[PDB]
Amino acid sequence: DSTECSNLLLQYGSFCTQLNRALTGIAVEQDKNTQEVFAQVKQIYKTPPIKDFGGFNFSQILPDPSKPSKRSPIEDLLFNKVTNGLTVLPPLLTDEMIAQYTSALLAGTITSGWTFGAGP
């Protein structure tokens, strides 16, 4: 909050603008990375209510209805196992929406194989 310090800081030019622009580029790049990795399907696929897959069990990777976060048991375990002018911007995609994208990908690859990745 020092006015004299800011007045002396203005003598150095646009260093602050460069640093803010670089941090902004990194911040938008993280969201772009999340879009590139997880948002590869424009259809939110869902599994059938009856889990008859010829003996194959996907309960550990499909979302758990009992959990409020709608995560898989594996994803829930993964989330449990990871623990002065600075601000932290929230990610554009929240964890439940990323989990929803993974659920859509899992439903597509279980019910349709590789067909959903190449078309209908």
């Binding site: 909050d1 803010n20 902004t24 969201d31 002065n84 002018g85 601000t87 932290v88 911007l89 929230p90 990610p91 554009l92 995609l93 929240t94 929406m97």
Partner: protein, 361 residues
């Protein structure tokens, strides 16, 4: 946004244009409770004062000295301070205070000063030229004068050489003004050094008795501990104020704290060595220091070809500290929140997106 982007046409999107700072509103200056007053009652309100020759010296240490009580009194005739001003006495701090007390005449008060001359300065009480302190004198014809004559106050009338500063001479040896030895008898050319002032109530104002207290303030290389009392501005909570607690200053919101400090601990630090907890010196309570809200100010707009309507996002700022909607990203002003879900047009954050159809979020 046009100013930041250096263009008169703004493409559709969100642009971080400025920053918001919750500006500080008040100043809270809390220092410790006023206790341990310095014994000024035993100097000024003494039942009897000493003579100018055997002047009483009281050393005052390790207490709180309130000088405004003396300065605002109407009972003192002289309050002449040399080397320091009376207004900053109640602020400054000194290692020791020397209170010299004696009784002199009315016309002899002017001689209690640096660089003066007279019987009192040369033979009774000498002040240094480099003197820092105050000379306080008041009339005491009521107490120190009786109708028969009060002969209890004396002054040294002679001596071979002048006194050094802050010297006391209580010797009762016969002054030798001549070549002949006195041999202890007050004969020819041999007089007695101490002479009384026959203080009578009917005297003139230049001959009436005056009680003089000289306070000497010195700074030595030891840490100064006799400090004048500081005040305590009424504590204000839940607002961004500038706090000064026992010399630790800063800006923050002071809220109630659940942290139980140990009795010897006063301030609190986190991992990053920033003061986030503090103890109030007046009332022993723990206060959390939350930093004042700061945030990026972003402008959400469609193209200027389409419309000139904008919305403002204050990032990480609650809506009560700034078509107002509260998001996890921050406070969004100018966008109408709807319950429908669409594709993301302008990204806001935390799953929130904005679009133009008015501006909706």
């Amino acid at each position: 946004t046009k100013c930041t982007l250096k263009s008169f046409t703004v493409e559709k999107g969100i642009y971080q244009t400025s920053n918001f700072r919750v500006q500080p509103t008040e100043s809270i200056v809390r220092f410790p409770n006023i206790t341990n007053l310095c014994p000024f009652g035993e100097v000024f309100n003494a039942t009897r004062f000493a003579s100018v020759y055997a002047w009483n010296r009281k050393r005052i240490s390790n207490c709180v000295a309130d000088y405004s009580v003396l300065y605002n009194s109407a009972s003192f005739s002289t309050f002449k301070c040399y080397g320091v001003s009376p207004t900053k006495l109640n602020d400054l701090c000194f290692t020791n205070v020397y209170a010299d007390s004696f009784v002199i005449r009315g016309d002899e008060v002017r001689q209690i000063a640096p660089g003066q001359t007279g019987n009192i300065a040369d033979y009774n009480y000498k002040l240094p030229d480099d003197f820092t302190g105050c000379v306080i004198a008041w009339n005491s014809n009521n107490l120190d004068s009786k109708v028969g004559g009060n002969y209890n106050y004396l002054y040294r009338l002679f001596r071979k050489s002048n006194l050094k500063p802050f010297e006391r001479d209580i010797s009762t040896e016969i002054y030798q003004a001549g070549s002949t030895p006195c041999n202890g008898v007050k004969g020819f050319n041999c007089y007695f050094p101490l002479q009384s002032y026959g203080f009578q109530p009917t005297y003139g104002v230049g001959y009436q008795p005056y009680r003089v207290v000289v306070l000497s303030f010195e700074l030595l290389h030891a840490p100064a501990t006799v400090c004048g009392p500081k005040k305590s501005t009424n504590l204000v909570k839940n607002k961004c104020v500038n706090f000064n607690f026992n010399g630790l200053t800063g800006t923050g919101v002071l809220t109630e704290s659940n942290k139980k400090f140990l009795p010897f601990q006063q301030f609190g630090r986190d991992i990053a060595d920033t003061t986030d907890a503090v103890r109030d010196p007046q009332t022993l309570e723990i206060l959390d220091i939350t930093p004042c809200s700061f945030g990026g100010v972003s402008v959400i707009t469609p193209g200027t070809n389409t419309s000139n309507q904008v919305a403002v996002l204050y990032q990480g700022v609650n809506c009560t500290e700034v078509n107002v909607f509260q998001t996890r990203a921050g406070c969004l002003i100018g966008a109408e929140h709807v319950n429908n879900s669409y594709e993301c047009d302008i990204p806001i954050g935390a799953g929130i997106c904005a679009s133009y159809q008015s501006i909706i979020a």
